[PDB]
Design a protein around this ligand. Structure first.
Ligand code: VO4
Length: 298
């Protein structure tokens, strides 16, 4: 039915109008804390802020602000934290948030440099022997191993609370070939990456919410979460026709502004959910076809 609607929209060439309708209906809640003068240098983009009601609060008396929202999908029973690419002065806040929220995975959908500009601080160590200490939040971060594929890398990190010496394993899923304001190369390569995150346990309810970010934390991040939530919803009663993609995105936009930034990203979301429904509906072989079609080797 999403498939019926998909074709009816393609036929009439009206993705822009559909997408603008979602823009017009989306929630509008206050972001008063994000706009305090003291938080000016904690925001990467003037027009991308967390709503107060859903923002993540750091557990520090000084300044609890970080540009991060909790997307709590009640019916699907999955939460995500969406956040901007950490700034040079907010890398400590970012890992503090990971620690306090008990996150087991970080999904990064951007590169540090995109189209000639620095979109994200280098907030994790690229070399085992060069670990990072964030003095402001008393955390230590060490690269343990990397699994490098053609278009994405998985990193095993060890995060240590220096105050208590507890250590945690964090999995880092880094999508290297998803252009800003763009789409993945194929449904297959997006779904292949999504299922790699699923298979790591990082999305289990035994863990804190997965942290998803790109540069702004709304476009690519929104696309990733919408696809995942829609597949989970349809997985609950094995009923693809019960999933209203636009309704789900609107429900997500109650927790963070601007989720999915272009009409083609919306269109891609439909493609990914439609293709992923094959797996949800009992065809497990399709998962290996995605791995093949994604060309992840070399
Ligand atoms: O860095 V994003 O523009 O895909 O929110």
């Amino acid at each position: 039915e999403m498939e019926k609607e998909f074709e009816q929209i393609d036929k009439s060439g009206s993705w822009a109008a559909i997408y603008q309708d979602i823009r017009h209906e989306a929630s509008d809640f206050p972001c008063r804390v994000a706009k305090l003068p003291k938080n000016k240098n904690r925001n990467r983009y003037r027009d991308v802020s967390p709503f107060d009601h859903s923002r993540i609060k750091l557990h520090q008396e000084d300044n609890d602000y970080i540009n991060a929202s909790l997307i709590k999908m009640e019916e699907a029973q999955r939460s995500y934290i969406l956040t901007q690419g950490p700034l040079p002065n907010t890398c400590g806040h970012f890992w503090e948030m990971v620690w306090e929220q008990k996150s087991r995975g970080v999904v990064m959908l951007n590169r540090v440099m995109e189209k000639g500009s620095l979109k994200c601080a280098q907030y994790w160590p690229q070399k085992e022997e060069k670990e990072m200490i964030f003095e402001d939040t008393n955390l230590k971060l060490t690269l343990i191993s990397e699994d490098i594929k053609s278009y994405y890398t998985v990193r095993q990190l060890e995060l240590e609370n220096l105050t208590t010496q507890e250590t945690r394993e964090i999995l880092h899923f880094h999508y290297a070939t998803w252009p800003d304001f763009g789409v993945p190369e194929s449904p297959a390569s997006f779904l292949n990456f999504l299922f790699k995150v699923r298979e790591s346990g990082s999305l289990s309810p035994e863990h804190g919410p997965v942290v998803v970010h790109c540069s702004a934390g709304i476009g690519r991040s929104g696309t990733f979460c919408l696809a995942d939530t829609c597949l989970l919803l349809m997985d609950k009663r094995k009923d693809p026709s019960s999933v209203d993609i636009k309704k789900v995105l609107l429900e997500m936009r109650k927790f963070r502004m601007g989720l999915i930034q272009t009409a083609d990203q919306l269109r891609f979301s439909y493609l990914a959910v439609i293709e992923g429904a094959k797996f949800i509906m009992g065809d497990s072989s399709v998962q290996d076809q995605w791995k093949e079609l994604s060309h992840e080797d070399l």
